[PDB]
């Protein structure tokens, strides 16, 4: 499932997790305030920690390419949650006029 930025906001308001799968350097330069960072490589090595698990998990990346290309991996990493992918990543979030945090 892909989810629009405005629809993701709605889910986050009901406690859904938003997971940034980018690297810490990317995150530090610009991120979504409500997102929790967990780079894909780390998730692949040691899985999703309990603190980031929820009924509803939304992954995001830069532009939607990384989540689309790693959809099966993300689906198992977050199982058995209801899992979504942020349409066009943070770039999508920006295009929808939602706030970001720039260093
Ligand atoms: Cl991307
Ligand atoms: Na995404």
UniProtKB/Swiss-Prot annotation:
Q: Which GO terms describe its molecular function?
A: thiosulfate-cyanide sulfurtransferase activity
Q: Where in the cell is it found?
A: Cell inner membrane
Q: How is its activity regulated?
A: S-nitrosylation competes with S-sulfhydration and causes small, widespread structural and dynamical alterations.
Q: Where is the Rhodanese domain?
A: 12-102
Q: Which residues lie on this side of the membrane: Cytoplasmic?
A: 1-103
The entry's free-text remark on domains says: The catalytic reaction induces conformational changes within the rhodanese domain, as well as in the transmembrane alpha-helices.
**Assembly mode:** Homodimer.
Q: What name has this protein been given in UniProt?
A: Thiosulfate sulfurtransferase YgaP
In its UniProt entry, the species of origin is given as Escherichia coli (strain K12)
Interval of the full protein contained in this chain: 4 to 106 of 174
């Amino acid at each position: 499932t892909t989810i629009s930025p405005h629809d993701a906001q709605e889910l986050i308001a009901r406690g859904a997790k938003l997971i940034d799968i980018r690297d810490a350097d990317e995150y530090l330069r610009e991120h979504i305030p409500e997102a929790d960072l967990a780079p894909l490589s780390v998730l692949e090595q040691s899985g999703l920690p309990a603190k980031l698990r929820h009924e509803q998990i939304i992954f995001h990346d830069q532009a939607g390419k990384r989540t689309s290309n790693n959809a099966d991996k993300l689906a198992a990493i977050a199982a058995p949650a209801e899992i979504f992918l942020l349409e066009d990543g943070i770039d999508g979030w920006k295009k929808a006029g939602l706030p970001v945090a720039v260093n």
